[PDB]
Subunit: 251 residues, 6 copies
């Protein structure tokens, strides 16, 4: 049975859940659910892996979005059809400000829309802005957990490579629009790049759904020393603790 | 008299160390806001820029009007920033476009739809006209503290009072294609209200390391179709912006 | 009042169909004083209005404030009250080395670096002045022996980054405007100001006549009485347009 | 020949600094024949050029072909050869009910519904005519008693969908242009044609003087009018 | 070990492969690889599942892209870094023309760019056009396999719902830009909707990589909104043979 | 006349459903002369038209003039008259260093640096050639053994600034086009010409088949203007295949 086309879920599967935590990576879903009570796997189809658990006695969904606005737009739409009204994205990210360190946590107030899917919900003039209650819950959760936290604007790119002005690529070329762009965002105070928030925040803010976004910084584009696949996992766990603690305040 | 800036007629000395400005649109509201604080005093008046200084909890605060629209606002914000202001709180009175937003309610704006031109002089359209979290938090908590009925969300910020707000009661009775059917669209997208300065204010601050927020009292609702409630709503939004200022010093 | 902002009724205009529209309220009486029977009508926000008489016909003088948004309110509401011809008068800098302080600029059309013009017509539409108004201004400039430049003005929603000024808090100019001044100079643009794109577009696209004249008081590319000449010119032009 | 398309040398111009530029190559000789000492210069592709004399001064008549792209080639190459003033003379319909067949239209500026104008200036820049040229055209129109309308023209890269014509192979008009004629009409636009946005923009942005006059032959909402041609020649006299 | 950030693959893993078949669904990768010789699983990370196999003695890669331009752009870039120079997308699609039947095979010559990732490689004026040799190989393979085939333009959308003008949704509405859009594309002869080709074709055509695109029709949108190996899959494998 | 500009009636076409469309009116007779029973039909403005016969079937040759606007008139009116397949034969500047003057370039799709294409489809729509037409051109080229390149073409509304030529009256190029040639070059674009974006877009979006081939007359990596036909043979042979 499925009430929706991609996720393979029914309303019954949600057990009344109205909040979903939405990481990008299917493999992180089980790990996040493990911070809560009585987690159980619901489904796995394409990049959409879903689990249900209990937070302070209330059902909550954890469901992966895959990379990018398009897959995110599917997961969010179908979760909304199923009854979800609040979405918390938990991600990993690359900071672009020299003063933001690996291990820091970033809470996004709004995003630069360097994506395409957001435009399928609202014209570019519309802000990709987070819900105030969600953002508040994330900031407060960061204080409860104890973290070095920055709150601000994130650049949300449809690509990992040229849209984040990476030159270490097959072509070594960046299209005109994005040449010099990282320095421009840096000067405008943008904290970081990631790949799903513009779509998530725009589609929710324009349809009466609540969304928030938190990420752990696993690399800094300005520093020469690159952490290993050890320190980066610790950072992940930190931000994950925060998103679950934030969810508790939103039930 | 000496001025450190081109339009406002102010020196750094006039600010006495102020780092926060409350910025209404109308010069006539400047004294009224200043009057709620300690040691209020007139500073200067040039064109639509009337400035007063006051004190909150021993710290200097500025109140300075912006005039109507992004262009005038952009001058005031730039020159105040040159003088040392780092936090800007806009206070306005507004209509509403949602059926359940009532006259007397308070609106705190998280971000704005950019239907202006001046914001593009600071950041490309993809950049969000987003309020500072600390400012928004202070405004929301101030509104709560006095028991106002508060809505928190998105505002549409227009370069015009008439066609950009899809008004047909005009000389031409025409609205350009871009704006035909636009009010119903913003309504469906959850936009609370129209006003005329916030896209410029929020974009220019968010992209230049300045903090900004905005609060407004609702004095009319076209979708729902009085002078007393108007001045009463005013006094309430004003007490909120001053109480928020206290938390941001 | 018949309108939302100006505090005027149709009767206040006494049949006036032409308005001179300076930016600053403090210049309104000065302009009105050059005409017969000048009287104050109203003052609200940055909209100060006076009525006077030119060759037996009523004329309005009304300030717009700074920028297209304020200007669009004044023009709309004056149009409702019966105004059909608008003449902007201002003082300006210049971005061409050959244009000197004391010179007079008549604008045939504007570069649309504003937002409000788009609320009246898409960008493809020209922010063009009315031919009769432009003719009147040029001929009025000539009748007083003014050194006159006639051409294109760049009309910016900002005083700072839109005019590519770097002497600012951030010291930054957004990509769109980086290198822009040199581009407009190479395209023969005379000067920057902040209201004409809105004025000219909203009028040209709604059957209203508009023109603009300005006195050059500074020139950023180079190392009072000028305001008076431009002012005499706009009043003389008004005479020919009644 | 110096220039690549026109087949002309600076010497062919004999010092000419003004060109009258019709769209149709077949109209070039007819305009030249109204002036002194008309001489054929060249004919290549849609570019037919003649020289003549007006009050003792050399003038050029050169066709542009239809559309901004070919217009942009003629203007550029003529500018290379010394032309500094360009007067377009066209034939045109009208989109305003009160504009009659026989009337003359002088264009102050154009709605830029073309592509070539963007190769000279961004869209924010006005496709505006030179004041001196427009004045000369209006004054020449008065001198001969022509019923004249002065104002804005819509300059389209197509004859069909861009002018919201549905009487076509597909019968389709793209979203951008659906309902557009009514919009231009409400905005006071006089007429459609196909060269002025490019002409006016490329000249206004490069220090060249341009103007345009057109005779109305049809009306969307409804050759003695010769009248337009007499006007462009009389205007040229005033611009030498 | 991995020579690339996301795929978990080294150059050595590819064993000289220069062509990749790139389905959207990770679960379809093993199925496609099984149609070829010596299929071997390489890696699975996020939405990127990769197998290697052999076709007429030459190594070939099958690697999923996930849904959408952004994940597609990662897979294509990293595969290119590892030496892949030809990419054949095999997808599922909703047809928007009355005469196109469920089960038909569509070969895309170029795409309507209703995505965002393509703009990260080339400005909108640049065509999202397929490689001629790849398109030819797909058309010729369709003859070899036997299938009802249509060749033409595809609309490639960053969304499954509003960008394909679907109304079976939470909001039940569609933003201005897309209101009435399906009938517009229909009138312009566009065959179908899918979600990866604009990004794939643009990023390849603008970077000296060859790409082709084929899909099996799973629904006809003029009629309905919610929809061994199919003809389309057999066709992409046969086309690969011709491109090695 | 059945149409406003071409001066032709349906009878003039004698059942023709394919047109070869050069830019230059002066080239029409020359192309017609390579086929059977060539007959002049009309000449108005930049539109010169001939009829001829190929393997017993009527074919039209008709000039478009320079640019998308005049091209859009010719194509529309020919469609009204019954033409369903269009083959453009043009001249072009190559922007890749190894492409020789005289080489034949077959266009799969065009960069839309024009305005007329937007009057038929929004910018997101690809200015793509018909597969059958492109196939016929490529196969005709190989059959005569011509040096041929197949790929993307930049199609500009101007000859000068939009093709980043600086040897001009102003010597300036507007921001949008500064550095643009190097960008197209890096993206693999083969060449510049001035009609294909309009032709390919208006045909692909209206159920007409179009193909595009051009002979290289200058290499832009070396000079802006050449010092003071395989392609034609190919367009005619391609036409044979599409009848």
């Amino acid at each position: 049975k499925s009430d929706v086309f991609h996720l393979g879920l029914t309303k019954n599967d949600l057990q009344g859940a109205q909040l979903a935590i939405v990481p990008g990576d299917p493999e992180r879903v089980e790990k996040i659910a493990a911070l809560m009570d009585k987690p159980v796997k619901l489904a796995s189809h394409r990049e959409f892996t879903s689990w249900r658990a209990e937070l302070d006695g209330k059902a909550v969904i954890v469901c992966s979005t895959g990379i990018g606005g398009p897959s995110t737009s599917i997961a969010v739409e179908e979760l909304a059809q199923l009854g979800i009204r609040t979405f918390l994205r938990i991600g990993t990210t690359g900071a672009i400000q020299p003063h933001i360190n690996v291990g820091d946590v970033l809470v996004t107030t709004a995003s630069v829309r360097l994506d395409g899917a957001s435009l399928h919900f609202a014209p570019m003039e519309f802000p990709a802005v987070a819900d105030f209650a969600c953002t508040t819950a994330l900031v407060e959760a960061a204080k409860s957990i104890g973290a070095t936290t920055h709150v601000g604007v994130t650049a949300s790119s449809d690509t990992f490579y040229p849209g984040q002005e990476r030159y270490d690529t097959y072509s070594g070329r960046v299209v005109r629009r994005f040449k010099g762009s990282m320095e421009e965002w840096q000067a405008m105070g943008v904290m970081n790049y990631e790949m799903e928030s513009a779509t998530l925040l725009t589609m929710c803010a324009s349809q009466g759904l609540r969304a928030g976004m938190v990420a752990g910084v696993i690399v800094n584009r300005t520093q020469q020393e690159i952490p290993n696949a050890e320190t980066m996992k610790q950072t992940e766990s930190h931000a994950v603790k925060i998103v679950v603690e934030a969810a508790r305040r939103l039930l």
